[PDB]
Amino acid sequence: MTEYKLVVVGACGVGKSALTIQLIQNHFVDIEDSYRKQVVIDGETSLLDILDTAGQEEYSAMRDQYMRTGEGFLLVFAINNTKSFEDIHHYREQIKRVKDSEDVPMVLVGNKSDLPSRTVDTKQAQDLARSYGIPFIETSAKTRQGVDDAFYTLVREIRKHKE
Amino acid sequence: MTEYKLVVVGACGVGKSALTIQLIQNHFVYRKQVVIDGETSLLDILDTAGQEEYSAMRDQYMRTGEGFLLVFAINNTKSFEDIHHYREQIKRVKDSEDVPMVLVGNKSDLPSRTVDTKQAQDLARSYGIPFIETSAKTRQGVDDAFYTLVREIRKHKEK
Amino acid sequence: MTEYKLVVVGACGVGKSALTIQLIQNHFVSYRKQVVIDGETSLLDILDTAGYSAMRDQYMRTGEGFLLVFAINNTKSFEDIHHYREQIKRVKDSEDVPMVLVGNKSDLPSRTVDTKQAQDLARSYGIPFIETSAKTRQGVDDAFYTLVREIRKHKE
Ligand SMILES: Nc1nc2c(ncn2[C@@H]2O[C@H](COP(=O)(O)OP(=O)(O)O)[C@@H](O)[C@H]2O)c(=O)[nH]1
Ligand SMILES: Nc1nc2c(ncn2[C@@H]2O[C@H](COP(=O)(O)OP(=O)(O)O)[C@@H](O)[C@H]2O)c(=O)[nH]1
Ligand SMILES: Nc1nc2c(ncn2[C@@H]2O[C@H](COP(=O)(O)OP(=O)(O)O)[C@@H](O)[C@H]2O)c(=O)[nH]1
Ligand SMILES: *CCS(=O)(=O)NC1CCN(C(=O)CNc2cc(I)c(Cl)cc2OC)CC1
Numbered sequence: 001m002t003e004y005k006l007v008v009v010g011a012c013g014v015g016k017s018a019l020t021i022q023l024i025q026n027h028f029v030d031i032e033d034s035y036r037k038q039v040v041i042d043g044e045t046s047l048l049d050i051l052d053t054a055g056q057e058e059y060s061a062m063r064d065q066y067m068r069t070g071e072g073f074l075l076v077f078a079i080n081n082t083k084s085f086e087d088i089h090h091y092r093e094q095i096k097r098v099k100d101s102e103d104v105p106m107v108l109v110g111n112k113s114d115l116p117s118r119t120v121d122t123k124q125a126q127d128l129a130r131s132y133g134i135p136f137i138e139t140s141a142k143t144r145q146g147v148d149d150a151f152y153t154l155v156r157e158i159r160k161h162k163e
Numbered sequence: 164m165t166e167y168k169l170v171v172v173g174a175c176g177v178g179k180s181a182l183t184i185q186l187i188q189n190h191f192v193y194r195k196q197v198v199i200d201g202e203t204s205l206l207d208i209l210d211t212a213g214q215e216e217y218s219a220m221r222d223q224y225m226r227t228g229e230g231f232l233l234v235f236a237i238n239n240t241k242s243f244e245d246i247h248h249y250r251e252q253i254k255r256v257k258d259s260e261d262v263p264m265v266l267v268g269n270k271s272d273l274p275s276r277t278v279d280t281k282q283a284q285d286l287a288r289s290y291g292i293p294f295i296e297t298s299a300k301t302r303q304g305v306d307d308a309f310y311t312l313v314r315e316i317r318k319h320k321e322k
Numbered sequence: 323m324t325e326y327k328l329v330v331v332g333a334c335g336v337g338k339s340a341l342t343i344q345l346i347q348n349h350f351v352s353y354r355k356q357v358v359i360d361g362e363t364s365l366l367d368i369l370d371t372a373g374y375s376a377m378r379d380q381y382m383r384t385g386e387g388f389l390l391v392f393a394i395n396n397t398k399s400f401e402d403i404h405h406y407r408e409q410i411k412r413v414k415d416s417e418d419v420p421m422v423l424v425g426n427k428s429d430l431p432s433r434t435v436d437t438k439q440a441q442d443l444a445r446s447y448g449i450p451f452i453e454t455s456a457k458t459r460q461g462v463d464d465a466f467y468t469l470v471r472e473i474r475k476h477k478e
């Protein structure tokens with residue numbers, strides 16, 4: 001069966017685990033960092049294998065393995081965390097180095113879109129995604145806004161790369 | 164608040180009018196304010212009645228519209244076969260290879276299906292657009308089809 | 323059979339005659355037409371004023387309901403609606419006159435009077451607003467039937 005190895009990267013606290021729980025287990029509570037589930041996306045059955053990582057957790061060799069084999073990456077920031085948005089370039093540069101490629105499937109995700117506290121403008125994030133040549137999706141793990149779209153868009157980006 | 168000009172296309176009798184009436188009036192026998200992904204918007208579904216038969220008028224509607232529902236009926240093989248030509252005509256007339264569109268397989272309530280979900284999904288996957296199965300009769304998929312189209316138009320505007 | 327006396331008013335060129343002929347004869351270029359409205363056979367007498375104080379006063383006083391027609395591509399015709407409304411209320415000597423606001427030519431691309439503007443004016447007057455195209459027939463029966471409904475509410 002087709003498998004997609006996905007890695008969700010971003011600063012601590014941006015909602016990577018919440019987003020992944022919402023996708024996989026369909027709920028939110030306001031915790032596992034790996035997940036595996038069979039889904040159907042655009043009529044194609046596949047298994048999603050997902051790691052959530054900020055880059056400084058304990059199991060660094062495991063993380064390096066997942067980084068090297070990851071077929072697509074969600075770059076997650078929170079709309080109420082300017083530092084998390086500033087960290088996105090670092091995470092993208094690290095992915096490109098480990099993958100040794102300038103063409104790695106990625107999607108930019110602005111999470112916590114339900115909150116009224118915003119310090120990152122949607123235009124700023126759109127502009128950054130445009131410069132990187134990747135999709136930008138606004139999400140809320142709390143309301144489910146954009147969640148399926150973020151992960152399924154990343155799967156579609158991987159398919160583009162494979163074909 | 165942002166307005167989105169939407170056009171429903173597809174073969175005669177596939178249920179374009181019925182989908183529009185279900186969306187706006189919540190009934191099975193052209194403007195609606197809705198909140199999609201936290202943003203309140205106005206949907207303006209262009210009223211093509213009494214003028215749909217004129218190619219010149221379809222051209223005008225295609226030029227005006229920001230996004231398109233490509234509607235076939237799941238019990239009408241020909242209507243599904245006609246989708247590609249309609250999509251090609253919209254691209255030509257709008258002089259664009261990037262026009263927001265959603266594929267819609269209507270009349271999902273019927274027993275007599277001749278277009279399978281896989282054929283339609285395969286089509287949509289090749290186009291890189293969403294596919295939604297609807298029924299204007301039971302309301303299945305109707306808000307989802309229109310709301311999804313608005314999401315496709317927003318993506319295109321923000322590229 | 324209950325008879326209703328309907329008067330179609332509005333600026334020159336807005337489609338008063340075209341609306342009335344579509345209603346009566348069902349094609350796109352007083353008249354009488356028998357219709358069934360809300361289950362009830364209804365004789366409609368319709369004066370198209372497309373063609374003087376004495377004349378005005380008679381048909382305004384005799385008329386039971388009024389279609390206030392503007393064209394959606396004719397800002398002046400929309401501005402003129404207040405002239406017509408005020409004159410009818412003055413001559414009839416009534417603050418409760420059955421009326422419907424009609425925005426015709428909905429088939430056109432060139433709209434300079436927005437739907438919201440017209441809805442807001444009709445809300446101010448406490449009357450319905452109906453968009454029509456005498457060309458495609460969209461809305462035509464609705465505009466006239468709504469007016470009959472307004473006359474019945476007044477009569478009850
Ligand atoms: N309002 C809101 N809170 C969220 C959302 N996503 C995550 N959270 C909360 O933010 C905190 C951090 O989330 P978590 O998933 O642990 O972040 P991670 O370190 O990136 O995995 C938790 O208290 C979550 O409930 C969201 O979309 N909206
Ligand atoms: N069973 C069923 N009938 C439908 C549905 N949608 C439309 N119809 C019927 O299909 C016929 C054509 O619909 P219409 O809206 O006039 O199609 P249009 O020509 O595409 O606008 C009418 O008899 C509708 O009542 C649907 O979802 N289910
Ligand atoms: N496009 C369009 N033209 C119309 C419509 N109604 C009337 N017309 C045209 O507008 C012009 C004036 O119409 P007419 O009925 O004579 O206006 P009147 O003076 O108010 O009676 C004519 O050329 C009509 O054919 C309509 O709904 N759409
Ligand atoms: C029901 C028969 S009809 O002749 O009244 N209407 C036909 C006209 C031809 N047709 C289509 O072109 C369907 N696709 C379509 C509809 C519209 I409205 C627009 Cl703007 C564009 C397209 O295709 C690009 C079927 C219905």
Ligand SMILES: *CCS(=O)(=O)NC1CCN(C(=O)CNc2cc(I)c(Cl)cc2OC)CC1
Pocket residue numbers: 329331332333334335371372373377378379380381382406409410
């Ligand atoms: C271009 C057409 S015209 O030369 O014949 N002049 C028009 C101008 C618009 N018009 C009216 O406003 C008629 N007013 C009117 C007549 C009657 I009879 C009644 Cl009951 C009411 C009104 O307006 C309140 C007609 C001719």
